[PDB]
Every structure is written in structure tokens, then in C-alpha cells.
Design a protein around this ligand. Sequence first.
Ligand SMILES: COc1ccc2c(c1)c(CC(=O)O)c(C)n2C(=O)c1ccc(Cl)cc1
Ligand SMILES: COc1ccc2c(c1)c(CC(=O)O)c(C)n2C(=O)c1ccc(Cl)cc1
Ligand SMILES: CCCCC1C(=O)N(c2ccccc2)N(c2ccccc2)C1=O
Ligand SMILES: CCCCCCCCCCCCCC(=O)O
Ligand SMILES: CCCCCCCCCCCCCC(=O)O
Ligand SMILES: CCCCCCCCCCCCCC(=O)O
Ligand SMILES: CCCCCCCCCCCCCC(=O)O
Length: 582
Amino acid sequence: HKSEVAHRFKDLGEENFKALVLIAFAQYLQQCPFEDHVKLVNEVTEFAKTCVADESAENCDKSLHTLFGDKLCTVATLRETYGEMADCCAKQEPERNECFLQHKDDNPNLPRLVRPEVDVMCTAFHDNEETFLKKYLYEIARRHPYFYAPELLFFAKRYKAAFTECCQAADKAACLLPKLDELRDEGKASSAKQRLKCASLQKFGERAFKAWAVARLSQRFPKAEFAEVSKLVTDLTKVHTECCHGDLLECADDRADLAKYICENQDSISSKLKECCEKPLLEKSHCIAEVENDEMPADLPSLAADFVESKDVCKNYAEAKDVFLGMFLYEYARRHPDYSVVLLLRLAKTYETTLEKCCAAADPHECYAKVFDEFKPLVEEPQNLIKQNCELFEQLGEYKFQNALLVRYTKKVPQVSTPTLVEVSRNLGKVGSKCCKHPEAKRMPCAEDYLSVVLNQLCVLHEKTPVSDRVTKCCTESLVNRRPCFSALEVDETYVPKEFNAETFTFHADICTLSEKEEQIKKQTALVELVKHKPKATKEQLKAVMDDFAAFVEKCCKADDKETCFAEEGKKLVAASQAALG
Ligand SMILES: COc1ccc2c(c1)c(CC(=O)O)c(C)n2C(=O)c1ccc(Cl)cc1
Ligand SMILES: COc1ccc2c(c1)c(CC(=O)O)c(C)n2C(=O)c1ccc(Cl)cc1
Ligand SMILES: CCCCC1C(=O)N(c2ccccc2)N(c2ccccc2)C1=O
Ligand SMILES: CCCCCCCCCCCCCC(=O)O
Ligand SMILES: CCCCCCCCCCCCCC(=O)O
Ligand SMILES: CCCCCCCCCCCCCC(=O)O
Ligand SMILES: CCCCCCCCCCCCCC(=O)O
């Protein structure tokens, strides 16, 4: 109460406090060495303990923003290292804090972080767990200044858990490696979603966010009253608006409040918030944001009652348009947890466009009478794609499914670079393996979650190295139109084939020692180049070539003087293949 530092220290706990303070400093002073930050953390922690012992001790009354800023301005090489940022220190709070936010660089120039060999890690881990973990916490945090700290803390613990379980295993690598790769992706996805959610808010505006949230919060809490959901969407919008601005403290308090509000009213929101609400102040938010959907009420009316058959439709709509559309969304979303949020938005958009026409016409009811028929094809498009694509993935495996997508998209946008096409298709493939395992009722929400990040990543690259107007149309298109726009792309009739290049199709024995992962990316790269050269090739033609290449390899890696083989049969394969594809 009287001392903020003392208060947070007591809430968080020493360990958590020390880690958060470290992350906080690493995100601002992204250039200072690790031992320098460690020094700061200790100084702040010691200060904190003083305040815990006596809330009236010097400076214990200062605000976290103030203490933090002062400490920051302490750094002697502040001007020589961060130049312009040092001028913030001449300002008074809150301009000082505001000034610091502005100079935090989003994408700093730091070397890629390379993964050491399992044995060095595990020994480092054992020989000095604290510094090994904090050292990486530091390296990761300085590279993602915008990654919400507590979230970064949750990942660290997932990492600690992996080293503990695996560094004792019989086959460390067999245990750890796959774990590290899983965490990396989750970390990447989490980072992407965060940037995405804020970028989306800037572009599309508050209304669109509120809509997306109404739909999402309604699928998850089907039993809550519309007024509660509204209350929540309202507060949730402030929270995200604030958290995007970047101030960790402000963000942290807004989220905490929201979580407490939710827990106090849990029995009037959802029956699934029990476990989450018991957890520590530091984990509540995270938990709730991931809670599973509650059971939807058994006795639920027909949507057509209040939205198609009622006589006061246009009257209720004209009176408060967005509120009316929100109720529609609410009602429609909580009966369809199986729908993707964006799909629900499309229906809402459709119902809106209809009421706008119909309520201005002679006899409204007559005009908007069959709107639910409008929805049918809208709902079906995403459903057929899932069925069709999961079936294909069922037959072929992940890898072969990835090759299928490779041929499919190269033909649609041959202008894209081969490395980019490879990454996209591979990740598209992963989405297929990760979601197709789910029961049909949960597939769509799954694909949407994963596809959103992949589509955004694809758009960002392209944004930097523009290549196709079509991709640009889809990338800058409506939030709700993005995926449909890509789905609508057709083979590029215009495209002009790339001239043959012997090199591009020559292979060496080294391919035999390449890691399974790199072997594929090598074959898949050739495949893309193959299509870019012979775009009019049919599935039959291609499949045959791919079959030869397949054999080609297995054969040359299981024979003496491998080198000769590849260069000898290579002439043959390539010569025959060119002939078959005219
Ligand atoms: C070359 O392939 C990658 C891919 C993703 C990567 C990194 C390197 C690095 C390392 C680097 O920046 O060089 C980081 C930090 N990545 C993340 O996005 C991330 C974020 C949060 C967590 Cl918890 C874990 C991972
Ligand atoms: C509970 O309320 C929300 C609100 C926005 C959301 C999400 C959930 C989720 C999570 C989910 O879909 O369950 C994602 C991925 N959001 C966005 O990226 C986003 C951000 C801004 C706009 Cl304008 C539109 C969409
Ligand atoms: C743009 C992504 C939104 C994710 C998110 C979420 O689902 N909940 C959320 C969950 C249920 C009701 C309302 C919001 N809160 C959340 C906010 C503060 C504290 C705890 C959870 C979130 O930030
Ligand atoms: C998330 C904070 C805890 C840090 C633990 C990370 C230890 C593993 C080091 C490898 C990280 C580089 C990312 C990768 O390519 O795997
Ligand atoms: C500078 C010392 C204070 C450390 C700053 C970090 C404070 C974070 C408070 C943790 C609250 C969890 C919020 C949430 O649920 O997301
Ligand atoms: C508080 C409830 C507000 C809900 C407003 C409903 C709007 C539905 C249209 C979907 C918005 C996507 C943006 C668009 O393309 O128009
Ligand atoms: C001009 C024709 C050159 C022939 C080169 C064929 C390269 C395509 C790579 C085929 C890899 C398919 C993957 C697999 O076999 O599993």
C-alpha cells in the first residue's frame, strides 16, 4: 500500500521478482552485458528487501516507474551506448517513462542465438543452473523487448523442466532436442500472435477488435449473460490497448485487475475457471486466457426467433446497431464453438449488410426473410476445405502432404522465392498434422489459430520484398477476407517458365549424410524449382519424376563410389525427365 516495491516483492516472491526485474532491464538496455544487468538486479532486490523490512525506509515510497527510471539513468555509458536515449534522463516523469518506450528498439541488430551441443548445455546446466538459465533469459529478452515479461517467465520454467528431465536421461539428445524444438515454435508463435494482435488493432480499429472478442468470449463462456460478456469485452479492449502501448507495469496491473474481477464473478461467467482462480497471482491471467470452453446450455431457443421472425428487428437494430449485431454474434457464437471466430464475423457482416438493405425497403420482413440461407454457403466453404485437406493429409504423410502443397502453391504464385515457398508449405503442413488429429468439432478453431500466424508471417516477408500484386491484395485485404482471398488464388496462366539450369538439379552424395530434416528441404527445394521450370506439368507427370528421383537417391546412397553414381545416373535422370515433360 504505502510502498509499491515492497508490495510487489511480497506478491511475486524473491525468485520471480529477480527474474522479472532482469527481463525488464534486458528489454530496455538491450546492449549492456549480462554481468551488468545482474549487478542491477541485486541492487534493486536488496533495495526491495529494505522496503519489506520497513515501508518507511528512504525511497520506499517512490513509484516503480520512478525508481526504475532513476536506476536506468544510473548507467554511466548511457549516452555513449544508447545516445539519444540518454536524453530521456533529463525529462521528468511520466515523460521520462514515455520517452523510454519510444527508444526501445523492436528489432535490434544481434547475432542469431545458436543452440549448443546437448552435452555442453547439460553440463553448463548442472555446473551452475542459476546463471545458465538467467543468461539465456537475458539473451532472449533483449531480442524480444515487446514480449510480455510474465509470459517470458512461463517459458523459462518450461525450459528448466526440460533440462531437468532430459539431462539425466539415457539419451539426452533423444529427450531434450525434440523438447527444445517444440518450445522454440511455441515461443515463435506466441511472439507472432502478440505482434499480430497489436498490429491488427492499429489497422482495423477498436470496433473490429470488440467484435472478434465478443465472438471469442461467447464461444468460451456460453452460459454468461450478454451484459457480462459486454463488460468483459469492454475491459479487455482497454487492457490490450494499454499492453500494446508497451508499459509493462500498466499492462501488468490492468491484467491483474481483470483476472480478479473474473474470479470473483466466476460462478456467473463459467464453471471452468476453478483451477485457474486458485493459482498464484502470477499465473492466473495466463491460465484463464487458455481455459477450455464451458458446456453450452441445453435448452436454447432458435436464433431465427429474435433475428428473423420478430417484428421489432429493424426497430431494435436502428435503436442501437452495434449492440444488436453484438447480441447476434453472442447468440450465434455460443452455439457454435466449432466455428472459427472469423467465420462468425463473416455471418455477422452478412446479417449487417442485409439489415442495411432490408430495413430501408417497403416490407422489411419480406426482404430479410431468407437471410439464414445466405449463411449456408459461407459456413460450408471452410468446412469442405478442412475435410478435403485432412483426407489428403491422412493418405500421404506430413512430408508428402507438404510436397502436395508445394506443387499447389508454386503454380499459384510462381513469382515467390523458393526458400519462402518451402517454409510456408512446411508450416502449412504442420498445421495439417496438428489439427487434423482433432475431432471435426474442433478442427476449424484450430486451423484458424495456426493459420493466422502463418499467413501473417507470409505477408510480412512479402511486404518487405513485394513480388505479387495478388498476394498484396490478400495481405492488405479485410481481416475477414484474408484466408478466403488466398483460397481463391488460381494457377498463374500468365507466368513465364524459368530457363533450365543444370546446377539447380545436380546432386551429390553429401545428400546421403544430410540430416533427415535437411534432406527434405533439399529435395523440396528442387521440387519447387522443378515446377517453376515446368509449370504446365500434370500431377501424373510430376509424380513419375518424383518417383524416379526417389529411387535415384536411395540407390546412389547404397552403392560404392557414391560420387560417380550421382553424377552418372544424374545425367540419365535429368535427361529422361526433361524429355517426359516436353
Ligand atoms: C533461427 O531460428 C530461430 C527461430 C525462433 C527464435 C530464434 C531462432 C531465437 C534466437 C535468435 O534470436 O537468434 C529466438 C529468441 N526465437 C524466438 O522467436 C523465441 C521467442 C521466445 C521463446 Cl521463449 C523462444 C524462442
Ligand atoms: C478474447 O478476445 C480476443 C480478441 C482479439 C484476438 C483474440 C481474442 C485472439 C485469440 C483467439 O482467436 O481466440 C486473437 C488471435 N486475436 C487477434 O489476433 C485480433 C486482434 C485485433 C483484432 Cl482487431 C482482431 C483480431
Ligand atoms: C487478444 C488476446 C486475448 C487473450 C486473452 C484472453 O482470452 N483473456 C480473457 C479470458 C476470459 C475473459 C476475458 C479475457 N485475456 C485475459 C486478460 C486479462 C486477464 C486474464 C485473461 C486475454 O488477454
Ligand atoms: C525462455 C528463457 C529460458 C532460456 C532457456 C533456453 C536454453 C536453450 C538455448 C537455445 C535457445 C535458442 C533457441 C533455439 O534455437 O533453440
Ligand atoms: C520493477 C519491479 C516490479 C517488477 C515488474 C513486474 C510486475 C508484474 C506483476 C505480475 C502480475 C501478473 C500480471 C498478469 O496476470 O499478467
Ligand atoms: C459490441 C459489439 C460490436 C460488434 C459489431 C459487429 C460487426 C460485425 C462485422 C465484422 C467486423 C469485421 C470488419 C468488417 O470487415 O466490416
Ligand atoms: C528437369 C527435371 C529434373 C529432375 C529433378 C527432380 C527434382 C525433384 C525432387 C523430387 C523430390 C520428391 C521428394 C521425395 O522423393 O520424397
